[PDB]
Structure 1
Amino acid sequence: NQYYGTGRRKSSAARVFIKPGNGKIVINQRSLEQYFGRETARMVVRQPLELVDMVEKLDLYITVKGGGISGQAGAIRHGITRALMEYDESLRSELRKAGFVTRDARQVERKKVGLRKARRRPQFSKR
């Protein structure tokens, strides 16, 4: 009845659900315009809704937990993408070529002993 998607940008998890509708999206029991304060953070969510024509026909309940503002937005983007994967599976040549199915495995690096910022080594004098 409801197509499912999962998204994770950096350290967040996204729960994305699809139903037919009139192009309305609710995020954590809250409108997206109220939730994502940043304009870029707002419209990255709806980026895949242009090359895919289903923008006006999908009501989209989403719950996203963890991470930060940009991370949650990237997680939201990846979750909608996957939720579409179990619907049409025929727009791959376009959607992959944009780069949305790809899971961003890039991650924050652990701190190292003898380093200040896990790669920055302390400034030293040669003498």
Structure 2
Amino acid sequence: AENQYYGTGRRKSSAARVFIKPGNGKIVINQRSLEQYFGRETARMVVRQPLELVDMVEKLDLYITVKGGGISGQAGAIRHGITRALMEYDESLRSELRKAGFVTRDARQVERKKVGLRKARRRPQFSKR
């Protein structure tokens, strides 16, 4: 319980800040409009795709701040950050969004570039003779 419920949208080590409240369906993305940020793009249809599914598109109001990631990919991070926030329409709500995997955090974490190695795991190539 919070004044405005909140999601962290952690997806593939980018974190999508997402503030939900009741309203008339309005959107803020990166302190600008949807039209500036996701212009003539499929990425505008991504953030709506989970909101349409729980049938609150014209009923939930939102404020969105996002760092790290790729332009297509950040829309993909906001798609977990919205479902993270949804927890209180019903007591079962977070259980079911977890069951669909859009609460379940992408547990796979980074492998450091390694010492004596060309990549994380790329060990040298040599024939040297």
TM-score w.r.t. structure 1 length? Answer: 0.78
Report how many aligned residue pairs link the two structures. Answer: 127
Note the residue ranges of structure 1 that are not aligned, 5 or more in a row.
Answer: none
Q: Counterpart of 2:11 in 1: which secondary structure?
A: coil
Name the structure with the higher helix share.
1
Change (3 A) 1:35 1:106: farther
What RMSD in Å do the two structures reach over aligned CA positions? 2.5
**Runs of 4+, deviation exceeding 4 Å:** none
Distance of 2:112 and 2:103 partners within structure 1: 27
Q: What's the CA shift string for 1:70-125, capped at 9, x where partnerless?
A: 55334322221121114433345653332111111223321112221212122221
TM-score normalised by structure 2 residue count: 0.77
> Hey, what does 1:113 align to over in structure 2?
115
* Deviating more after overlay: 38-47 vs 2-11: 38-47
The structure carrying a bigger strand percent of its residues is 1
Does 86-95 or 105-114 show the bigger shift? 86-95
Q: CA 1:92 to 1:11, structure 2 compared with 1: closer, same or farther past 3 Å?
A: closer
Q: Is the 8 A contact 1:11 1:71 kept in 2?
A: no
Q: Unaligned 5+ residue runs, structure 2?
A: none
Deviation at 1:27, TM superposition (A): 0.6
Partner Cα separation in structure 2 for residue 16 and residue 36 of structure 1: 17
- Between the two proteins, what is the percent identity of the paired residues? 100
Superposed CA offset, 1:54-79 (max 9, x none):
11101111111233335533432222
Structure 2: distance between partners of 1:41 and 1:122: 40
